[PDB]
Amino acid sequence: EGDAAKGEKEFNKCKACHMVQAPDGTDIVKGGKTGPNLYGVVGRKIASVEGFKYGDGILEVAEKNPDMVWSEADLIEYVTDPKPWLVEKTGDSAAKTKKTFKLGKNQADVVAFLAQHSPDA
């Protein structure tokens, strides 16, 4: 039950590493390249952005669950605390992650913002 307008503001915490760019090249949120493009992330297969070098943990999630896509519930959990999410999904206490950034509040709002820019979900 997120507020996409509030999520757009919270996304300032994400944009250091993530852009939101449409397939025609249009920049919705200009941001960094340390993490993958988040345009269309809602409903997207886990760890499937072409050309991005993902960590072993999240690829294992994708490998072990080939039909898994990002749902709003899962995105909320992952953005709250990425590492334990990977541990939960892989069953591997040593799951490797390229990021540990945690968002403690307004997670549903950020996910609402991302859903807004996943129009074909």
Sites of contact with ligand HEC (CB under 6 A):
13-14, 16-18, 34-36, 38, 41, 46-47, 49, 54-55, 57-58, 75, 79, 97-99, 101, 103, 110
Comparing CB distances to ligand HEC, the nearer of 110 and 112 is: 110
Residue with tokens 């507020």: 3
Comparing CB distances to ligand HEC, the nearer of 25 and 53 is: 53
Q: Least distance from C-beta 49 to ligand HEC, angstroms? A: 5
DSSP secondary structure string, the chain?
A: ---HHHHHHHGGGTTTT--EE-TTS-EEE---SSS---TT-TTPBTT--TT----HHHHHHHHH-TT-B--HHHHHHHHH-HHHHHHHHH--TT---S------S-HHHHHHHHHHT-TT-
Comparing CB distances to ligand HEC, the nearer of 25 and 74 is: 74
Q: Least distance from C-beta 23 to ligand HEC, angstroms? A: 15
